[PDB]
C-alpha cells in the first residue's frame, strides 16, 4: 500500500477481438467466448469477454471502472486478472479464458472421478486466493462455486468482483445499498444490516466448500430465500456432507457462527486445509478414492 502500483491497464478496440459463442447470459450482461488478436503480433489468445448491460446513470457508470480497476490491479495465482478493457458506449471487460468453466459446473459433471486430493486442494487454493484479496483490503461479497473458475483441474482461480469494494485507511467494514445479492451465500449480518467484511466472505467460503463436498448440491434447496435469516438465527445450518469427515465439517460449522469474530481467518484456513491436503483420505471419505486420479505437482496467454 505504498509502492508504485504500476498495473498495466491495456485498452483495446472492438476490432482486436471477436466473440465466438456465448457462455453466460443474464441481466448482469452477456459473457462470450472469443479470441483476442492484439494489434500487430500474429497470435490469437482465447478470452472471456463480459459485455454487461448499458449503464443507466453516471453514478452507476463510475462503478464499472472501479470493478475494472481492481480486477486489473490484482496479481495472484488464484485470482483472475483483467486482461484488457474496451471502452465503447457499452463497456467490455476482457479476461484470459479459463476453458473448463466454473468449478460448480465442473464438480457436477465429473462428480464421479473427483477424488479427495482434488477437493481439498481446491479448498486450499480458494483460501490462498481470498487471503490475497484480504491483504489488499478487498471484500469480495460474492463467493460461490459459480464464481470459482477452473483454469486446469489442478489450478483454480477466483473471479467476478461485480460487488468488490476497497477498504479505506481506517475501515473495518462496508455498508451496501440495495442491489441484487445471493441471500443463500451471505452471513447473517449481511442479510440483517448489509454488512460486508472479510469475515462475511469467510461465511461464503464455508458455503462454497460445502458446495464442493456435496458435489454440486443446492444449499438449502426448496427453502425460499426469504426466511433464510430465521432458520439461521434459529441455529440451523447446512447438513454434514455424506463424504465429509467431522474434522472437515467442523470447519464449515465454525465458518457459520453468528459471531463474525469466531469464524476462522483465511490465513488459518489455508494452513488447516493444507495440513489436511497431506493424507487426504483421513479427512474425506469417498467410495473409490483408491481409484481417482492425483495431480502430480490457437495460442494461450501468459505471452
Ligand atoms: C458441460 C459443461 N458446460 C460446458 C463447459 N463449461 C462452459 C464454460 C466454459 C468456460 C466458462 C468461462 C467463463 C469465464 C469467465 N467468466 C467470468 C464471469 C468473467 C470475468 C471477467 C470478464 C469476463 C468473464 N472468465 C474467464 N474465463 C471463463 N471461462 C464458462 C462456462 C461448463 C458448461
Phi, psi (degrees; rounded to nearest 5) at 92 = -125, 135
CB-based contacts of 264, cutoff 8 Å, min separation 6 = 202, 251, 254, 255, 272
- To one decimal, the resolution in angstroms is 3.0
* Cα 90 to ligand 1 centre (Å): 20
Give yes or no for a contact between 200 and 191, defined as CB atoms under 8 angstroms apart: no
Judgement on whether residues 6 and 124 belong to the same structural domain of the protein: no
Residues lining ligand 1, CB < 6 A?
A: 23, 31, 48-50, 93, 95, 97-99, 101-102, 105, 109, 149, 159-160
Give yes or no for a contact between 191 and 229, defined as CB atoms under 8 angstroms apart: yes
Q: Is 142 a catalytic residue?
A: yes
Could you tell me if residue 18 is inside a domain? Answer: yes
Task: Find the CATH number of the domain harbouring 251.
Answer: 1.10.510.10
Judgement on whether residues 118 and 259 belong to the same structural domain of the protein: yes
Closest by CA position to 116, among listed 203, 212, 247, 204: 212
CB-based contacts of 284, cutoff 8 Å, min separation 6 = 116, 119, 120, 213, 243, 244, 245, 248
Give yes or no for a contact between 26 and 53, defined as CB atoms under 8 angstroms apart: no
* Cα 254 to ligand 1 centre (Å): 31
Distance from C-alpha of 300 to C-alpha of 142, rounded to nearest angstrom: 28
Which residues sit directly before a break in the chain (C to N > 2.5 Å)?
297
Closest by CA position to 153, among listed 117, 207, 127, 128: 117
Last residue of a domain, one of 34, 67, 97: 97
Task: Find the CATH number of the domain harbouring 84.
Answer: 3.30.200.20
Angle of helix 246-255 relative to helix 266-277, nearest 10 degrees, comes to 170
Distance from C-alpha of 229 to C-alpha of 188, rounded to nearest angstrom: 6
Given 105, 142, 261, 289, which residue is catalytic?
Answer: 142
The radius of gyration of the chain from alpha carbons, rounded to an integer in Å, stands at: 20
Closest by CA position to 13, among listed 42, 40, 31, 33: 40
Give yes or no for a contact between 128 and 269, defined as CB atoms under 8 angstroms apart: no
Method: X-ray
Question: Which structural domain range is residue 212 located in?
Answer: 98-298
The alpha carbon dihedral of 163, 166, 172, 176 has a sign of: negative
Mutation choice for ligand 1 from 19, 30, 31, 145, CB with most ligand atoms inside 8 A: 31
With DSSP H G I counted as helix, E B as strand and the rest as coil, what are the percentages for the chain, rounded to 5?
A: 35, 15, 50
Question: What does the chain come to in residues?
Answer: 303
CA atoms within 13 A on the CB side of 17: 29
Give 5: exposed, middle or buried? Use CB within 10 Å, 0-12, 13-18, 19+: exposed
Give ∠ CA 191-197-201 in degrees, rounded to 5: 75
Cα separations in angstroms, 244 against 184, 192, 250: 21, 30, 10
* Cell numbers that stand for 227 in this block: 426466511
Amino acid at each position: 500500500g505504498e509502492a508504485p502500483n504500476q498495473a498495466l491497464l491495456r485498452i483495446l478496440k472492438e476490432t482486436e477481438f471477436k466473440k465466438i459463442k456465448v457462455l453466460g447470459s443474464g441481466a448482469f450482461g452477456t459473457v462470450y467466448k472469443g479470441l483476442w488478436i492484439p494489434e500487430g503480433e500474429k497470435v490469437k489468445i482465447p478470452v472471456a469477454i463480459k459485455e454487461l448491460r448499458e449503464a443507466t446513470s453516471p453514478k452507476a457508470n463510475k462503478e464499472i471502472l472501479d470493478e475494472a480497476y481492481v480486477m486489473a490491479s490484482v496479481d495472484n495465482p488464484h485470482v483472475c486478472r483483467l486482461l484488457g478493457i474496451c471502452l465503447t458506449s457499452t463497456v467490455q471487460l476482457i479476461m484470459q479464458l479459463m476453458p473448463f468453466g466454473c468449478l460448480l459446473d465442473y464438480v457436477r459433471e465429473h462428480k464421479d472421478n473427483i477424488g479427495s486430493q482434488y477437493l481439498l486442494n481446491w479448498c486450499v487454493q480458494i483460501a490462498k486466493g481470498m487471503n490475497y484479496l484480504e491483504d489488499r483490503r478487498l471484500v469480495h461479497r460474492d463467493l460461490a462455486a459459480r464464481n470459482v473458475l477452473v483454469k486446469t483441474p489442478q489450478h483454480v482461480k477466483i473471479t467476478d468482483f461485480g460487488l468488490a469494494k476497497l477498504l479505506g485507511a481506517e475501515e473495518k467494514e462496508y455498508h451496501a445499498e440495495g442491489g441484487k445479492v445471493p441471500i443463500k451465500w451471505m452471513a447473517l449480518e449481511s442479510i440483517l444490516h448489509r454488512i460486508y467484511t472479510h469475515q462475511s466472505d469467510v461465511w461464503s467460503y464455508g458455503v462454497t466448500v460445502w458446495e464442493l463436498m456435496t458435489f454440486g448440491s443446492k444449499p438449502y434447496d426448496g427453502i425460499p430465500a426469504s426466511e433464510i435469516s430465521s432458520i439461521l438465527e434459529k441455529g440451523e445450518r447446512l447438513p454434514q456432507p455424506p463424504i465429509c469427515t467431522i474434522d472437515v465439517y467442523m470447519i464449515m460449522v465454525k465458518c457459520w457462527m453468528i459471531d463474525a469474530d469466531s469464524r476462522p481467518k483465511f490465513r488459518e484456513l489455508i494452513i488447516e486445509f493444507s495440513k489436511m491436503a497431506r493424507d487426504p483420505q483421513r479427512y474425506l471419505v469417498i467410495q473409490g478414492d483408491e481409484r481417482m486420479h492425483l495431480p502430480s505437482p490457437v495460442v494461450d496467454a501468459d505471452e
